[PDB]
Design a protein around this ligand. Structure first.
Ligand SMILES: Nc1ncnc2c1ncn2[C@@H]1O[C@H](COP(=O)(O)OP(=O)(O)OP(=O)(O)O)[C@@H](O)[C@H]1O
Ligand SMILES: Nc1ncnc2c1ncn2[C@@H]1O[C@H](COP(=O)(O)OP(=O)(O)OP(=O)(O)O)[C@@H](O)[C@H]1O
Ligand SMILES: Nc1ncnc2c1ncn2[C@@H]1O[C@H](COP(=O)(O)OP(=O)(O)OP(=O)(O)O)[C@@H](O)[C@H]1O
Ligand SMILES: Nc1ncnc2c1ncn2[C@@H]1O[C@H](COP(=O)(O)OP(=O)(O)OP(=O)(O)O)[C@@H](O)[C@H]1O
Ligand SMILES: Nc1ncnc2c1ncn2[C@@H]1O[C@H](COP(=O)(O)OP(=O)(O)OP(=O)(O)O)[C@@H](O)[C@H]1O
Lengths: 362, 362, 362, 362, 362
DNA sequence: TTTTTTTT
């Protein structure tokens, strides 16, 4: 009796798996008796224990197959095709709406009955971020609109401030929220070709702390980052489709996605300054160090640098109407949970703790 | 029973889909019962909702196949082969009349019963564009003619001027009209070969804001595109059918397309200066800026970037007889629709507001 | 009758082999009779003698196969797929627990009846290592925790001091204790792309002997490793997923691992100094040298380089509670075995000899 | 029944089609009933209507094939192999035969229905050139035979003349007529090796003018090209095969092609002078330049830079017997055309205007 | 009837061939009638004449196969697989023992009844080599043990002395005896990367003729050799692994081999001096020069270059117990042959003749 | 074949 390639394809689709080796490895686990499957019994990974019983019979036949890599390749191609279809047909707002549903599904696990992390430590992170900048949640909402609208040559925000000002942290949290990638531009112009190939078919890019020049006056070690970017004015502008690499693969032509750039304070030529729409300034604050020095669980669990914390911040602060119409129900549900789990006075206490630079909890 | 590769290819031809993943993805959507297909019901995408009912049976059998990518390969190659054969056997006029028919087909939908575009917003775009330079439509006709005639060493026009002067904006609309390609050559000489590969079988090309030299006198940092163009002068002359390249494929002898260049004001070498039909200056004009600042929905919807605005402009400004012959029926049909929609007062009231710097729709 | 590919995949899994040639070459040995197999009878090599008699009949049929490399390719893929799955799903603690289990398995062999090693020689090395720094075992525990926790920015330790202060000796031991590989970044900037590719999916990294510049005053030969490092600033921070490259392969995206930097007494930019948690300051000492001269069986058997030596140190000094819970069973048996062999007086006698600069043994 | 691979290959040979996508594209068109075929009915392309009826039955079966691209690949190989075989049998006269037979077919466009500049203007260019210097038609036939005979040392002619002597304009027409390539030699020797390799396997070359070593003694730019050339002794002579050097590729070796040199009027060494077969000698003349200033459409059409004007000139002046035996059959036809087009008195009146300095077409 | 792939693989294993083309061509020769085979009858190559009779039948079927290169690939894979198994599993003593067996086999041919060599001339070779240094046979035995033990730090030997004082002669014979490859470090650092790639999987390396700097004080050409070496202190001391790279290959990681460094009288930094176990002085001795001048068959047959001569020297001088236990039987057999064919007095006479600087033989 | 190497 033969393998159902259809069952494999369905698993890959349902998992959103898009690496042939992950798919291969994952599917093989299901060859063993699901009844005794310790991973199921431990409820260890949902992408396993939800599926093992259903896929078990087909995995036993797959384990004998001579074709295995070919079956997995087709399944991965089906997932990749779905992404391309979506990218060409969804509005950007639907893309974000889908991305939000996925994060909310994780939150249903994180704070589920399994309760693998506690909502107090997570909510504590929100207060720390809210203190990081003035009017923080307003700044986040502006950024989301900007990325969704994707207005030509109004597409990039510049983060500037000293070392350890917090700019990388905020970028990292935003990048998780929207989904996207970081790219290193402090590199030679040749291999840079394939670096940009990474950006194919994605929502955001982040360029990290690109080195400028002449800042060694202030001991900013100089480098090609700024020179490199100014070759790519068109990529930022987003007025024209551009052609993107991959190894052993032909060009893809598409608009280069919007994003943000982080900078210790080298100088900027005005060709490039003209292309940022908004610069934000970041500053060291010792009481914030002191808070972290006590509340080190924030860093160990990477709470403050994670997009989940930004979503929780938005849920706490924004009217339900500001969310895309479909998810508004799930937002109401989480607003209710949060209002139930915390008084405002508790949140005010946490903010005061952060302000005092004591550990967030007392 | 067995997949009809014939029916697959027929859909590929009819959508003009020419990507193997895009084709693969979309055809798989047809495997479900079209009678409940929410996309059909909701009339979301014509590339789906027209074809689903027809292709359904074959798509179910396709969904079972083990050959899927290979089927899509042969289908795509038929689409590309049509393009190549058509590329040789048609006159540039016939090419352009095909392109215009395609855009007219979109417009028939965009202002159709779905009608999601306001004609008057779109016409406000036309006003802004014809306001950008005198006799805008007339210079557009001169450009179109020059590209149809495609005369050796009279095949390129230069746009030169400072940032935010609109040169990029105009190139976008022309390129969206003509169906060409952008290329970037601010790059290491040896690497450009596959970038030039994109020029295979294109009506037109555009080079964006190429890096020159000596402009750092004025904060324009130097780069190689200037020298690259000098070496590429062979293609710019377009005397002979150069053998263009693409990965894992045979190379392709053809005449290099004509095109446009945009420039912030670096030096020009005499040899490059020698090669143009024409130069055009571009000049920041604050009253337009003040208008857009109110009227920003124009730019949000990219109206002023989009060739559909130019086509509406030429329908408005130009004689029916100025168009190529066979389309002149559709020209009249659309001329009538504009004539039905507008008083000249409405247009003039708008163009007044544009000249002032008011919200165009006051 | 036909090859069982399943038996080959089992052998690959059981040996954890991931070279197609090594797998092939070993599997082919099983085709002769195990009953006369002199390697079995000499019981020379465990990856052979455990398995020959099981695999025998399938090896004989495999010897006749026309497909041999395809069979091995599928088997090696399964072992590679297993690693990929684990690299997503295991905790860093659980990885380290696995790594320990395998070293402990080699320790069971080395000190077995096969008796390739003298535990007294190996314990001598622990005395030399524990003498090299204050509170040596505490330093190892703090480092291991740091690598398990992987706290952003707080990820890297800097080793510096004169040449011949044992810094690379110590780095080697840690690197063998964990998983990982070394890297040399004094390179030209372009080849660096493939240098960093080595880090993919690994646990530790060690940057080896980074040349600074300006050290020529201290007679240090000079180079660009430090300036290269300050370009890789985000790789140290580990705050966001970077892109990594191998020859003929698409870029992987992942967090760059934590690790150690070794150098002589150059200076370091603030941007890079800010990225080290801890700076260990090694010193030349004569008694270590004069002891080691009279103790050269240490170097001749590579004892003080090797991870097995550090593991013996931890088993001696650290409480059973400090190990991950599942290995505490094996740890207790090894603790018993050690004390059954060595009195404290014997160990202190060894440390006394080292402190005296006498040959460790007496 | 089944696709005849035989018939597909016949068409590829008969059309000399040597691109797999074109072959695929065109052959697919035959699948419709030729009896109705509108392309046949309108005689639009011979490459179609010559063949459709014969190939139709095979094309119907071809359209159902699942191997289609593979059939076309084998067919294209056959055509490429034919070129490969013949490339090793070409006499230089047989080579020349084709290289003009090609241009006669191109000229079936030049004054076909395309007719894109006046056959009058084209002969007016011929008029203007024929009175630059003596007997120009004979001079072409002589230079032509020189390049076909390729007699060692007896292979190179020199254009000596000041700035604006026309030698560059002439050189344009020469390479245009004949093929070959232009080259520089004023590089530093350090560079020049690769530049010399560029000539590899061209039938002919031009050298762009040496900037005289000490040439500015004449008020003409100084440079290195003199000593560079006379150091390149043997390349000129073609006595023996020489090594040649492509960038990024290994050596090749070949008899160095014959050709042409341009010079402004520098201090040619006796040795360097002795290399040449024939100086030709050029200076400003007033009827010429003032006629240009009155015939400027010829420069705008660059006809006076045109080798096609030279081919036209030979077609006019020279005996039929001077052309190779069979290709002669075409030249009479263009003469017949040109004679029906023009009396002598026309070409006379044109020539008179040039001699008078009058605008040639007056 | 079928081809036996097994018989081909046996021949490949038997001949140790690992080039597919060399394997292919040789097997095809067996298809002609062994019963008349001229190559057999001339006894030209053992690799042919030993096997033709055996493989004749299979080669006849092989000659008709359509799969020929596919068969050879699997065969060559088997030989490469054998090498990689051996590469990991053998001891360094086992490796050398195998190497010795190979030379002993070649000697059995060279001096056989078919033997084209002269055992007396090769014995004259041993006399000249034994004269080149003090204690020569004791010195060789010391060098070998050093390579077999591969003790870190204690790994490398330095040769120095004038030009034409024999150093590379000895290096070449040692390199032939052990196997290994020579390296050139007198480079800029960029190419040095692929240079070291040669060392992968070698038993020995020789650093030929390292240029110091400042030897120009005494007319030695200055260069970057020594300066490049002292970067690589880890590579010599061999305590820890290094990364190694070849063109088009992913990096490997291993202990860098032991080896020899050679120079004229350049100055040596003490940093480098401490790297070496031993330094051997060579001095030009005129009686050797006059002996070669009268004993030219030594040079012309390359006798004194050959590792076979050093092997003969070991066989003649060393006690049987010094060889690896397995080969001691062959050593006894060769010692018997040599003691039979040469008296001690005769060998001593040759040694006396070399001391006289007269020709070796009388 | 591309890529990597070459090239700078
Ligand atoms: N505003 C702040 N005040 C004090 N400490 C801060 C602040 N922001 C960040 N930190 C500390 O700095 C560390 C690094 O933050 P982050 O990487 O976001 O800064 P950055 O300015 O982007 O730095 P860099 O340019 O070096 O990447 C944080 O983990 C936290 O410990
Ligand atoms: N003539 C103009 N006057 C004022 N604003 C202008 C003008 N043209 C363009 N703009 C503004 O400049 C923005 C960018 O226009 P565009 O990219 O076409 O200019 P550009 O001259 O090509 O610039 P750059 O050289 O920086 O790419 C537009 O979105 C619009 O907001
Ligand atoms: N603290 C010490 N005092 C004196 N000698 C030492 C000390 N530590 C190591 N040694 C000696 O130094 C030798 C080399 O050690 P190692 O290679 O680790 O030195 P290193 O200074 O860390 O080297 P590098 O800087 O080149 O990596 C050891 O084999 C030992 O002989
Ligand atoms: N025979 C001629 N008589 C007068 N003017 C001439 C003649 N030939 C060319 N010209 C003038 O010379 C100008 C440049 O022509 P061309 O480049 O062909 O000359 P050249 O001698 O090769 O020049 P250069 O050495 O400067 O490159 C033409 O545009 C024309 O004005
Ligand atoms: N000890 C010696 N006394 C005299 N002549 C010698 C001696 N050794 C070598 N020769 C002569 O020197 C020639 C070259 O020897 P060899 O190539 O080994 O020299 P080298 O000094 O090691 O060279 P290099 O350093 O250039 O590689 C030999 O062929 C022989 O003629």
């Amino acid at each position: 009796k033969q393998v159902s390639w259809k069952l494999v394809t369905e698993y890959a689709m349902e998992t959103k798996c898009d690496d042939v080796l992950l798919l291969l490895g994952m599917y093989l686990e299901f060859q063993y008796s699901f009844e005794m499957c310790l991973k199921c019994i431990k409820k260890e990974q949902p992408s396993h224990y939800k599926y093992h019983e259903k896929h078990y019979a087909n995995a036993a036949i797959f384990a004998d197959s001579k074709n295995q890599k070919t079956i997995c390749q087709q399944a991965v191609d089906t997932v990749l095709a779905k992404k391309r279809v979506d990218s060409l047909q969804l509005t950007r707002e639907q893309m974000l709406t889908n991305r939000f549903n996925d994060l909310l599904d994780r939150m249903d696990i994180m704070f589920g009955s399994t309760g693998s992390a506690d909502i107090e430590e997570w909510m504590a992170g929100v207060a720390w971020l809210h203190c990081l900048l003035p009017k923080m949640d307003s700044v986040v909402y502006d950024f989301l609109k900007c990325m969704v609208y994707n207005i030509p040559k109004k597409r990039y925000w510049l983060f500037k401030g000293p070392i350890d000002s917090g700019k990388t942290t905020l970028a990292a949290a935003l990048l998780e929220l929207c989904g996207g990638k970081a790219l290193n531009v402090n590199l030679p112009l040749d291999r840079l070709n394939f670096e940009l190939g990474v950006a194919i078919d994605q929502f955001l890019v982040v360029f990290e702390d690109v080195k400028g020049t002449g800042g060694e006056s202030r001991d900013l070690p100089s480098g090609q980052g700024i020179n490199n970017l100014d070759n790519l004015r068109d990529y930022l502008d987003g007025s024209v489709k551009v052609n993107l690499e991959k190894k052993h693969l032909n060009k893809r032509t598409q608009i280069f996605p919007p994003g943000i750039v982080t900078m210790n304070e080298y100088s900027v030529p005005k060709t490039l300054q003209a292309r940022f729409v908004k610069q934000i300034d970041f500053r060291p604050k010792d009481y914030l160090k002191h808070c972290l020095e006590r509340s080190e669980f924030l860093l160990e669990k990477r709470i403050i640098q994670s997009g989940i914390a930004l979503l929780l911040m938005l849920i706490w602060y924004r009217p339900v109407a500001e969310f895309a119409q479909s998810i508004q129900s799930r937002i109401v549900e989480w607003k209710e949970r949060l209002d139930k789990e915390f008084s405002l006075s508790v949140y005010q206490k946490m903010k005061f703790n952060v302000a005092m630079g004591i550990g967030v909890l007392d």
